[PDB]
Amino acid sequence: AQIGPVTDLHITNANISPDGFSRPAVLAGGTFPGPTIAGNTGDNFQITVFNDLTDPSMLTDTSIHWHGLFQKGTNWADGPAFVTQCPIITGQSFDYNFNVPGQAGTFWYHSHLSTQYCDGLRGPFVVYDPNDPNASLYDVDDDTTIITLADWYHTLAQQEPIGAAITADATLINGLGRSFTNTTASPLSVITVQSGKRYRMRLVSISCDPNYLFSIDGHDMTIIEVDGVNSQQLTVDQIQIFAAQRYSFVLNANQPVGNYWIRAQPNSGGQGFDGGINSAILRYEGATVEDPTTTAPTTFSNPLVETDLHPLADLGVPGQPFRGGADDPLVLNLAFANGRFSIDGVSFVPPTVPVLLQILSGAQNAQDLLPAGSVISLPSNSVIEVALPAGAAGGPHPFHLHGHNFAVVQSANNATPNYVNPIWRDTVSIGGTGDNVTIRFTTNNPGPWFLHCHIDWHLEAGFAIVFAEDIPDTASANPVPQAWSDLCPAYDQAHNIST
Numbered sequence: 364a365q366i367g368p369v370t371d372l373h374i375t376n377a378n379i380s381p382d383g384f385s386r387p388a389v390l391a392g393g394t395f396p397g398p399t400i401a402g403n404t405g406d407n408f409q410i411t412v413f414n415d416l417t418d419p420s421m422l423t424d425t426s427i428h429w430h431g432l433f434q435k436g437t438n439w440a441d442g443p444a445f446v447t448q449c450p451i452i453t454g455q456s457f458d459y460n461f462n463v464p465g466q467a468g469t470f471w472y473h474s475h476l477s478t479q480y481c482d483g484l485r486g487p488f489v490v491y492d493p494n495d496p497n498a499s500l501y502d503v504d505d506d507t508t509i510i511t512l513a514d515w516y517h518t519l520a521q522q523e524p525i526g527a528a529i530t531a532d533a534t535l536i537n538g539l540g541r542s543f544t545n546t547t548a549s550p551l552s553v554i555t556v557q558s559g560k561r562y563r564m565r566l567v568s569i570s571c572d573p574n575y576l577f578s579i580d581g582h583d584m585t586i587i588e589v590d591g592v593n594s595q596q597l598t599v600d601q602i603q604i605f606a607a608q609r610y611s612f613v614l615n616a617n618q619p620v621g622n623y624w625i626r627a628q629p630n631s632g633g634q635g636f637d638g639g640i641n642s643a644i645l646r647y648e649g650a651t652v653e654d655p656t657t658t659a660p661t662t663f664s665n666p667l668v669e670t671d672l673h674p675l676a677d678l679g680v681p682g683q684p685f686r687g688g689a690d691d692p693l694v695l696n697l698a699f700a701n702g703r704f705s706i707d708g709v710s711f712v713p714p715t716v717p718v719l720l721q722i723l724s725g726a727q728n729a730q731d732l733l734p735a736g737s738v739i740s741l742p743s744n745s746v747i748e749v750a751l752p753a754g755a756a757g758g759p760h761p762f763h764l765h766g767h768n769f770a771v772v773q774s775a776n777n778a779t780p781n782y783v784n785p786i787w788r789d790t791v792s793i794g795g796t797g798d799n800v801t802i803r804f805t806t807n808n809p810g811p812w813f814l815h816c817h818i819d820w821h822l823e824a825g826f827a828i829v830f831a832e833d834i835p836d837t838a839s840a841n842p843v844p845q846a847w848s849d850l851c852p853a854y855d856q857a858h859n860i861s862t
C-alpha cells in the first residue's frame with residue numbers, strides 16, 4: 364500500500380538480502396526500497412519521521428530530502444543536512460510539514476546526510492494529478508507501475524574511501540536483483556501486465572552513482588513525463604537514466620502473452636546479463652511461470668536523446684536567446700583532484716551551523732556565510748543561467764538543483780543550445796569533455812538551495828555549492844516551527860558540539 368500524505372515514517376536498522384547476500388541497512392518503513400509516499404497535487408504532506416537508528420556504522424542521525432519538491436515557503440523542510448537543518452537524533456522525531464502546489468509527477472525521497480541513502484534510505488514519492496493532461500494515454504497507474512532502479516553495495520557506505528571510484532555489487536529492480544560476483548539465482552522482480560492494457564510506468568532512479576541503460580525486450584516506451592514535467596509523447600526503445608532522474612512512459616502490453624526481460628545495464632560494475640544480473644521480468648497474465656528467453660538487440664535504434672524531449676505545456680525559456688542572455692549569468696568551474704571535487708576552487712565541507720539558520724540569525728550576504736566560498740547569493744525575481752562545463756573525473760556527472768526545476772538550454776554531447784522549447788527537469792547529465800550543459804531558471808523561491816552532483820560519493824567528496832536565493836526575504840518567506848528551531852540545540856548537545 365501507498366502511505367501519505369499524512370503519515371508516520373520509521374527509520375530503522377535491519378538485515379536485508381536483496382541479491383542473496385545479507386548485510387545491515389538503514390530502512391524507511393522496514394523495506395528496501397522504502398514505501399511509496401503519495402498524494403495529489405496541492406496536498407499538505409505531513410511526514411513525521413521517527414529516527415529509531417542504533418547502529419553507528421551507518422550513522423545514527425538522519426535527515427530526509429523530498430527530491431524535486433520545490434518547498435516554497437518551507438525551505439526548513441527540504442532536508443539537506445547542514446544546509447536547511449541539523450540532523451534528527453536517534454530516539455527523536457520530526458514533522459516535515461509542507462505543501463505541493465503546482466507540482467504533479469514522479470519524485471522520490473532519500474537520506475540527505477552523508478552517504479547514508481546508499482545504505483538503504485530511499486523510496487518513491489508520487490504526486491498524482493486528478494486532471495492529468497496525459498490521463499487518456501493509459502489505463503493503469505498505481506503502486507504496481509512504479510519501477511525503481513538501484514545500486515547495491517556489500518560494503519557499508521561509511522567504509523567507502525572518500526573520492527574513490529566506488530563500484531556496486533548488484534543492480535536492484537524493484538528491490539531485487541543478482542550479485543555481479545559470486546552470483547546466486549536469488550529471486551528476480553516480476554512486473555505483471557494484462558494483454559491489451561496500457562500502463563503508466565513511473566521509472567525512478569534511486570541510484571547513488573551509476574546511470575542505467577533501461578529497456579524492455581520486445582517493447583518500446585512512450586515518454587510522457589521527465590523529472591515531474593509533462594512532456595510531448597516521445598517513443599523510444601532504450602532510456603539512459605542518470606542518478607535521481609525520473610521518467611513516466613506508456614507501456615502498451617501489445618506483444619504476445621509471454622515473459623520478456625527488463626534490462627538495466629549500469630555504466631560501472633557488472634556488464635551484461637549472465638546469470639540474470641541487471642535484470643527483471645515482464646510477465647503477461649496467462650504466461651508460464653518461467654524466465655524469459657528473449658534477446659536484446661545488438662544496438663538500439665531509437666534511444667532517448669535529451670534534445671528530443673519537449674514540454675507538453677508551452678514553458679519556453681526565460682531570458683534572451685544567447686549565451687549570457689540572463690540577469691545573472693554564471694559559469695561554474697567544476698574540477699576534481701586528489702580525491703576531492705571543487706566548484707569555483709572550493710571543495711564543499713558541511714558547516715557546523717546550517718546555512719538557513721545562519722541566515723535567520725542575521726548573516727545577510729554570501730561572504731558572511733559558511734562555508735566560506737561555498738555559498739553564492741542569487742538576486743530575487745531574476746533570470747539565472749548556469750553553465751556547467753564538463754571534464755572533471757568520474758563523469759558523466761548528474762547535477763541537481765534543489766527548490767527548482769530548470770530549462771536544459773544545452774544538453775550533453777550536443778554543442779547547439781535550444782532557447783525555444785527544451786525540456787525542463789531537475790537533474791541533468793553534464794556530459795563529457797568539451798560539453799557545456801547549461802540550465803536556466805527564475806528566482807521566485809527565497810532560501811538556500813543546494814546544487815550538487817547527485818553521485819552521492821561525489822557530493823561527499825565536495826562536489827557542491829549552495830545558492831542563497833534572495834537572502835533578504837528568506838526569513839519572512841520561511842517561518843520556522845519550534846520543532847525545527849529545536850533540532851540544532853538537540854543535535855549539538857548530543858554530539859558535544861559548541862555554537
Ligand SMILES: *[C@@H]1O[C@H](CO)[C@@H](O[C@@H]2O[C@H](CO)[C@@H](O)[C@H](O)[C@H]2NC(C)=O)[C@H](O)[C@H]1NC(C)=O
Nearest residue numbers: 686687688692693694750752753797798799801
Ligand atoms: C560555456 O558557456 C559559457 C557562457 O554561458 C562560456 O563562458 C564565457 O567564457 C569566456 C572564457 O572562456 C568568457 O570570455 C565569457 O565572459 C563567458 N561568458 C559568456 C561568453 O557569455 C564558457 O566559455 C563555455 N565553456 C565551454 C567549455 O564551452
Ligand SMILES: *[C@@H]1O[C@H](CO)[C@@H](O[C@@H]2O[C@H](CO)[C@@H](O)[C@H](O)[C@H]2NC(C)=O)[C@H](O)[C@H]1NC(C)=O
Nearest residue numbers: 668670671772774777778779780781782783785
Ligand atoms: C542538437 O541539439 C539541437 C538543439 O536542441 C537540436 O536542434 C533542433 O533540431 C530540431 C529537430 O530537427 C529542430 O526542430 C530545431 O529547430 C533544432 N533547434 C536548433 C536551435 O537548432 C538537434 O537536433 C540536436 N542534434 C541531434 C543529433 O539530435
Ligand SMILES: [Cu+2]
Nearest residue numbers: 428430473607
Ligand atoms: Cu535527490
Ligand SMILES: [Cu+2]
Nearest residue numbers: 430431764765
Ligand atoms: Cu533535491
Ligand SMILES: [Cu+2]
Nearest residue numbers: 760816818821
Ligand atoms: Cu559526480
Ligand SMILES: [Cu+2]
Nearest residue numbers: 443765813815
Ligand atoms: Cu541534494
Ligand code: NA
Nearest residue numbers: 679680681682
Ligand atoms: Na522566452
